[PDB]
């Protein structure tokens, strides 16, 4: 689809059988989702942006469905203000910025 | 053009006689730039990131050239780790996400 930007680019994603609303963020290297338990081992990590750092749990090779498009990659879980889909998964679904 | 996301989407922007590299950020409601004096009245504002909030100065009706595309709007100035072009200006140059 084509998403305009007059409103925040929020889409529905499916992960671990649960539906969640997430922001398509070209300004994020990685994908960060709100606190939730996911299967598989995880490693502690620290990521940052405006305001400073936060501690997250890194899960690898996690299948995520974005607007019907499948992706399998790294997902960070932590106290983020909104679910964020970063470039690591945006590239997998073939997302581009155009103008 | 069509910008792929294998790498951070940085572009050159022009403000007055000033050149700066800025990130085309669909995950940002507003545009914030790193230290640079702008003309006119400015109002204090608080904006939120992944780790908390920072204080910035809000300047309105600022002409900004993005990749040969003219845009005019609110520009925030504060301690952002990266110059950011937010949705307020991305909409003016007809920028969309596509997949």
């Amino acid at each position: 689809p084509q998403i305009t930007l007059w409103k925040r680019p929020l889409v529905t994603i499916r992960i671990g059988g649960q539906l969640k609303e997430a922001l398509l963020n070209t300004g994020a290297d990685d994908t960060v989702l709100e606190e939730m338990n996911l299967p598989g081992k995880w490693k502690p990590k620290m990521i940052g942006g405006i305001g400073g750092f936060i501690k997250v749990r890194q899960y690898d090779q996690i299948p995520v469905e974005i607007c019907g498009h499948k992706a399998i990659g790294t997902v960070l879980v932590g106290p983020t203000p909104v679910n964020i889909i970063g470039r690591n998964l945006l590239t997998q679904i073939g997302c581009t910025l155009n103008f | 053009p069509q910008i792929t996301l294998w790498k951070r989407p940085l572009v050159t922007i022009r403000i007055g006689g000033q050149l700066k590299e800025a990130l085309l950020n669909t995950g940002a409601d507003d545009t914030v730039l790193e230290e640079m004096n702008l003309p006119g009245k400015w109002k204090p504002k608080m904006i939120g990131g992944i780790g908390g909030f920072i204080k910035v100065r809000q300047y309105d009706q600022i002409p900004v050239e993005i990749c040969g595309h003219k845009a005019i709007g609110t520009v925030l100035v504060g301690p952002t780790p990266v110059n950011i072009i937010g949705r307020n200006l991305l909409t003016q140059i007809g920028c969309t996400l596509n997949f």
Partner: peptide, 10 residues
Amino acid sequence: IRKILFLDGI
């Protein structure tokens, strides 16, 4: 520090 640049304008 510049990896996740979400920015809330409110």
